[PDB]
Design a protein around this ligand. Structure first.
Ligand SMILES: *[C@@H]1O[C@H](CO)[C@@H](O[C@@H]2O[C@H](CO)[C@@H](O[C@@H]3O[C@H](CO)[C@@H](O)[C@H](O)[C@@H]3O)[C@H](O)[C@H]2NC(C)=O)[C@H](O)[C@H]1NC(C)=O
Ligand SMILES: *[C@@H]1O[C@H](CO)[C@@H](O[C@@H]2O[C@H](CO)[C@@H](O[C@@H]3O[C@H](CO)[C@@H](O)[C@H](O)[C@@H]3O)[C@H](O)[C@H]2NC(C)=O)[C@H](O)[C@H]1NC(C)=O
Ligand SMILES: *[C@@H]1O[C@H](CO)[C@@H](O[C@@H]2O[C@H](CO)[C@@H](O)[C@H](O)[C@H]2NC(C)=O)[C@H](O)[C@H]1NC(C)=O
Ligand SMILES: *[C@@H]1O[C@H](CO)[C@@H](O[C@@H]2O[C@H](CO)[C@@H](O)[C@H](O)[C@H]2NC(C)=O)[C@H](O)[C@H]1NC(C)=O
Ligand SMILES: *[C@@H]1O[C@H](CO)[C@@H](O[C@@H]2O[C@H](CO)[C@@H](O)[C@H](O)[C@H]2NC(C)=O)[C@H](O)[C@H]1NC(C)=O
Ligand code: NAG
Lengths: 126, 614
């Protein structure tokens, strides 16, 4: 009955985080986020890229201010479960982070609209 | 090298007004009023208001002493309870017509407050001066109040591990980055606003560990830096940070002699009544082998402005592959120019503030605060290089001579409580005089000039008190020759009054006055009797003020040789006739000889009529 394996197509995996509470697993992949049951059943999928980006440019990546912006893939840089949210940091957009609802991966809680240098969290390079 | 001070004035032989409060020390902060008649002194745990015309007249007093629970808190942090754990006034700046902005170390809790001038009582604003004032009385510090906003350079913390150049604005607070490219172990020396589309700039001067140079030990380097008054920081990057911070080497050296002075001690801004461009007079000492040497380099603002406006920046690069080396950047520079102010050009490209500058430009300045070009002195050499003297602070007065030839008068203080007056004569330094300001040889920590009509004074602070000196002592000169030979642009000889007067002060007629900076006392118009017993000994006293002149004696119209047994010289100037007899009677003349240019100037110092009894 439950999957014994999880092999996502058209992507590579970076990170895994287990929710001590519910047993829920979250997966950080290239341009994808997955929510699995403790039995590996796929529950939710979120797209994370590609995005128009350049390591030389600051988010929000504006084409008029960043003409060298080119489509970039988004390997997951950081994926950690906090009491309130799922903490998500990518390789893209200066290593900016976001907060998603635990159990409702699709539901975004916090993703700063216009972030500054003090909010560039993770390594902007896989 | 500069010669020795022509004349030495003992604290005893000149009129110097002194001020100190019993049990109050470290008179390091000096500020004079708008009216120039009231000088405010910032000391350790106290602030005073003294009559600037007679510093000894104490007008007002206010204390800001540290509590025992605060002293013990400081001591428990392994500091000295009776030394460092006290309130050293570090910030003494004008705030308004009715108030001053005051900050003290305060047993390592930098605290700021407003001194109410009408009451001479503190308002108890009790502001946290962290960033504005140093914690340690040992730490470097600089501050300039610009448009009621404090621009300060000091340490951001207790240990002095975090440096900071910042603006306590309230509207738009801005500070430097805590990074080696920005500041690398600086020791703050001086700051001021250089006022004007074009924005004002706030210049900073300091010594820091060099990134461009590598030697046996870490090499220090003097720095000239500036920020734009209108800075508001970057929007996405440089959030609450300087976007206009650019720095450059300040070079003071004579290379044909291997002399390099890489430690900046003081900076004075010569604000010319005539010249449209200000000149920075900077005082330096060498880091290596200082024994000690001092140099005074004068820098034209335009030169520095040229480096900051058009100079190529320096790039940092990785080198094999754990090292960093700094080289000239010859790559593409963004537009608007990184580090530039919001000028006429920027406003045309719809840029109103730093907050709307492209991230390209902001990132560039953040990664390139250092310029490749050095800021060099006027005539590419120091104005003065001196040996056997450790100079501490500097002031300059631009004065017009009788002739109309303008001289920039350098008042330089020493680490032994002395003041030297020097002028760069025709391609050579002339140290007019030296005065012992402090009877206790206390180093002059701070120096402040008032060249204003009437109240023409220099004010020097040390740990023991404050001294008030005039800019000249013209009256000390006895003869016309002595007055001219001084070669002081301030002093002229008055034939009607038979006194050496202070030109641009006295009410004597200009057209009928004598002054020659050449030292040719030729422009000038032109007997102590003794009766000693036979066999006895005579001491004929003779003295003069020139440290650059030597005295010889004459008897019976011939140059007498002060040799045993008949003659002797006591103190190299006083003649000693040993065995008095009939023939020793007559006129004895003490004469001086001093070289000015090529020529020698002989003067009759003493005239004596010695008569030996029978
Ligand atoms: C400080 O640096 C500034 C930057 O150049 C110096 O100013 C300029 O000096 C040049 C040199 O002569 C001036 O050019 C010309 O002067 C002659 C003399 O009469 C005149 O006949 C020419 O028609 C021309 O004006 C230039 O105008 C002048 N500009 C300014 C704004 O001063 C300044 O002299 C330097 N000061 C010191 C003490 O080094
Ligand atoms: C503020 O002004 C006072 C007035 O002179 C300064 O006092 C002096 O402090 C120094 C030490 O920093 C004393 O020197 C001695 O050093 C030896 C070396 O270890 C030590 O063993 C002695 O016990 C003593 O501390 C000096 O004697 C003392 N002067 C007097 C008259 O007591 C004070 O240093 C100044 N503070 C600042 C920050 O400038
Ligand atoms: C600064 O000091 C003056 C000196 O007293 C203060 O003046 C008093 O101000 C009150 C009103 O606030 C008047 O009623 C008193 O008559 C004033 N006395 C004198 C001698 O002038 C002034 O208020 C102080 N300023 C601040 C901000 O405290
Ligand atoms: C230093 O920064 C503080 C931080 O705001 C400034 O404080 C404000 O001062 C104004 C009057 O100038 C008051 O009206 C505000 O209510 C104060 N706000 C706070 C939070 O203190 C202070 O004035 C600045 N000092 C200088 C000399 O620039
Ligand atoms: C000039 O200042 C230097 C220090 O910068 C003096 O050198 C110190 O002199 C004291 C006196 O004995 C020594 O104990 C120190 O070890 C010396 N330090 C160094 C680095 O040399 C120097 O004597 C002063 N000379 C003059 C003429 O002022
Ligand atoms: C001011 O200076 C004069 C000059 O000697 C002196 O007599 C007078 O006492 C001084 N005033 C004070 C308060 O010391």
């Amino acid at each position: 009955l439950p999957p014994t394996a999880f092999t996502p197509n058209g992507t590579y995996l970076q990170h895994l985080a287990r929710d001590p509470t519910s047993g829920t697993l979250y997966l950080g992949a290239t341009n994808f986020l997955f929510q699995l049951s403790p039995g590996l059943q796929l529950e939710a999928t979120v797209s994370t890229g590609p995005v128009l980006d350049s390591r030389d440019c600051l988010p929000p990546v504006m084409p008029d201010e960043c003409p060298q912006a080119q489509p970039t893939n988004n390997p997951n840089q950081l994926l950690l479960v906090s009491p309130g949210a799922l903490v998500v940091c990518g390789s893209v957009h200066q290593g900016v982070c976001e907060q998603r609802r635990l159990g409702q991966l699709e539901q975004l809680l916090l993703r700063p609209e216009r972030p500054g240098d003090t909010q560039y969290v993770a390594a902007n390079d896989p | 090298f500069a010669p020795i001070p022509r004349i030495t004035w003992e604290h005893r032989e000149v009129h110097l007004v002194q001020f100190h409060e019993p049990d109050i020390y470290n008179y390091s902060a000096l500020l004079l009023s708008e009216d120039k008649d009231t000088l405010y002194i910032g000391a350790r745990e106290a602030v005073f208001a003294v009559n600037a015309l007679n510093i000894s007249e104490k007008q007002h007093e206010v204390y800001w002493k540290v509590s025992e629970d605060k002293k013990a808190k400081c001591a428990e942090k392994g500091k000295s309870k009776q030394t460092e754990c006290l309130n050293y006034i570090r910030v003494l700046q004008p705030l308004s017509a009715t108030s001053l902005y005051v900050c003290g170390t305060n047993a390592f809790q930098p605290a700021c407050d407003h001194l109410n001038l009408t009451s001479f009582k503190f308002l108890g604003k009790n502001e946290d001066g962290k960033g504005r004032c140093p914690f340690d009385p040992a730490h470097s510090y600089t501050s300039v109040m610009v448009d009621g906003e404090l621009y300060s350079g000091t340490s951001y913390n207790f240990l002095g591990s975090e440096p900071i150049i910042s603006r306590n604005s309230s509207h738009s607070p801005l500070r430097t980055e805590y990074a080696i490219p920005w500041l690398n172990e600086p020791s703050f020396v001086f700051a001021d606003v250089i006022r004007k589309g074009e924005d004002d700039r706030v210049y900073f001067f300091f010594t820091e560990v060099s990134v461009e140079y590598e030697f046996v030990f870490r090499v220090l380097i003097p720095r000239i830096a500036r920020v734009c008054k209108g800075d508001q920081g970057g929007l996405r990057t440089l959030q609450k940070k300087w976007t206009s911070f650019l720095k450059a080497r300040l070079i003071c050296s004579r290379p044909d002699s291997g002399l390099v002075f890489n430690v900046l001690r003081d900076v004075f801004v010569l604000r010319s009544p005539g010249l449209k461009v200000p000149v920075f007079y900077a005082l330096f000492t060498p880091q290596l082998n200082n024994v000690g040497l001092s140099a005074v380099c004068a820098y034209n603002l335009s030169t520095a402005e040229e480096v900051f406006s058009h100079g190529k920046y320096m790039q940092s690069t990785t080198v094999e592959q754990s090292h960093t080396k700094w080289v000239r950047y010859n790559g593409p520079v963004p537009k608007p120019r990184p580090g530039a102010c919001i000028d006429s050009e920027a406003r045309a490209a719809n840029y109103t503030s730093s907050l709307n500058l492209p991230d390209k430009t902001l990132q560039f300045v953040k990664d390139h605060p250092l310029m490749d070009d050095s800021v060099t002195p006027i005539d590419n050499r120091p104005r003065l290089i001196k040996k056997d003297v450790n100079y501490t602070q500097i002031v300059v007065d631009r004065t017009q001579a009788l002739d109309g030839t303008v001289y920039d008068v350098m008042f330089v203080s020493t680490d032994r409580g002395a003041l030297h007056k020097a002028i760069s004569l025709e391609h050579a330094v002339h140290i007019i005089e030296e005065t012992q300001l402090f009877q206790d040889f206390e180093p002059v920590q701070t120096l402040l000039l008032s060249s204003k009509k009437g109240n023409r004074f220099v004010y020097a602070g040390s740990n023991s008190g404050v001294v008030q000196a005039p800019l000249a002592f013209c009256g000390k000169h006895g003869t016309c020759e002595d007055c001219v030979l001084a070669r002081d642009p301030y002093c002229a000889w008055s034939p009607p009054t038979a006194t050496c007067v202070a030109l641009h002060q006295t009410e004597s007629p200009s057209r009928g006055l004598i002054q020659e900076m050449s030292g040719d006392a030729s422009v000038c118009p032109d007997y102590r009797q003794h009766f000693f017993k036979h066999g006895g000994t005579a001491e004929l006293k003779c003295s003069q003020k020139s440290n650059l002149a030597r005295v010889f004696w004459k008897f019976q119209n011939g140059v007498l040789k002060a040799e045993s047994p008949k003659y002797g010289l006591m103190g190299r100037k006083n003649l000693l006739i040993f065995n008095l007899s009939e023939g020793d009677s007559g006129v004895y003349q003490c004469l001086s000889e001093e070289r000015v240019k090529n020529k020698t100037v002989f003067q009759v110092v003493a005239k004596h009529v010695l008569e030996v009894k029978v």
